[PDB]
Amino acid sequence: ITGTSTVGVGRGVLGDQKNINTTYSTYYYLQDNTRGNGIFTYDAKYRTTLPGSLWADADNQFFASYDAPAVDAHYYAGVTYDYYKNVHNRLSYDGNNAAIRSSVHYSQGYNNAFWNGSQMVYGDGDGQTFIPLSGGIDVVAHELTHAVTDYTAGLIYQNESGAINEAISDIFGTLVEFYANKNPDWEIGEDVYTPGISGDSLRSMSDPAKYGDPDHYSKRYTGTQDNGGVHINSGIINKAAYLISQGGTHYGVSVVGIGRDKLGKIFYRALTQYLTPTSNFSQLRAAAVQSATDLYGSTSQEVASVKQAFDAVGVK
């Protein structure tokens, strides 16, 4: 909407206070005009119609329990925008400052969040499996990264290309979590998953098998569930990315780590220059090798480490 840019204050899902960019016109709206063509957050009001209503607040203070998922969806979309702009010189998900839209309070007890091709959508969780999913910065950034993928490589959401799609979202979700530097880790969703259980998460990149996901191509899922295992076989690529960044020995193969920043540069370049809608795991390895060659040189440690990491997970 048309109005003037303002700064509100609120509390997120985890009870932390933060400032949020709003717009004043009669009401204060969750519309951040400081980033691209705007970040807009909507109330789905427990329904499944989307987007719902642009979030309106009478006083620019967002401390009600009902406000918390909206505060975090809005704020973490801003952090994710900042990561892509400041780290990769990418302006929003399309590279042209497309407006970023999110809806919260989607459905009732909905234990998921997603990018729907047009916008991000967050359930509130059922209070046992999840609390409202926008409380996880890695979740928010995972979702917005699907939009980046859609506009770049276009990886089809099935089988190996879909597992790459998922892993790219986990990788950049994690790199955004490190960028914000609040309790960063290599696990996915820990801040919103199972409030009654400490120390768990949906997935681990450092040890995918902790939650039943494969960490070697020989253990890949070959069935039809989950669009051919897109959230399962992602563990093979997540493990490779973890090894590239942090190093380690895995099934007897040693990888010299090169750090998170170079991991991000290599995978961002692979995603935006080399991957295609039908890329498989072997093609991802080649894309990563070529990206590291472009950035660091063919004889570099970085190229050598990409090769050892894919070797370690059984991808040639």
Supply the residues annotated as catalytic: 143, 231
Site for ligand 45X in 204-233 (CB under 6 A): 211-213, 232
Please report, for residues 41, 162, 253, 305, the alpha-carbon distance to residue 245 in angstroms, rounded to integers and kept in the order given: 34, 22, 15, 9
Residue closest to ligand 45X when measured from CB atoms = 212
Contact flag: residue 223 with Ca ion (CB under 5 A): no
- At closest approach, how far in Å is the CB of 227 from Zn ion? 11
Total residues contacting ligand 45X by CB under 6 A comes to 4
C-beta of 191 vs 213, nearer to ligand 45X: 213
- Say whether 301 counts as a known binding-site residue: no
* Interaction site with Zn ion (CB under 5 A): 169
Among 25, 34, 53, 183, binds Ca ion (CB under 5 A): 183
C-beta of 225 vs 249, nearer to ligand 45X: 225
- Say whether 193 counts as a known binding-site residue: yes
- At closest approach, how far in Å is the CB of 192 from Ca ion? 8
Residues 6 or more apart in contact with residue 35 via CB below 8 angstroms: 21, 78, 81, 82, 85, 92, 100
C-beta of 75 vs 281, nearer to ligand 45X: 281
C-beta of 203 vs 262, nearer to Zn ion: 203
- Say whether 166 counts as a known binding-site residue: yes
Report the partner that residue 169 touches, choosing among Zn ion, Ca ion, ligand 45X, none (CB closer than 5 to 8 A by kind): Zn ion
- Say whether 21 counts as a known binding-site residue: no
Q: Contact positions toward Ca ion, by CB under 5 A?
A: 57, 59, 61, 138, 177, 183, 185, 187, 193-194, 197, 200
Q: Which residues are annotated as a binding site for Zn(2+)?
A: 142, 146, 166
Q: Which residues are annotated as a binding site for Ca(2+)?
A: 57, 59, 61, 138, 177, 183, 185, 187, 190, 193-194, 197, 200
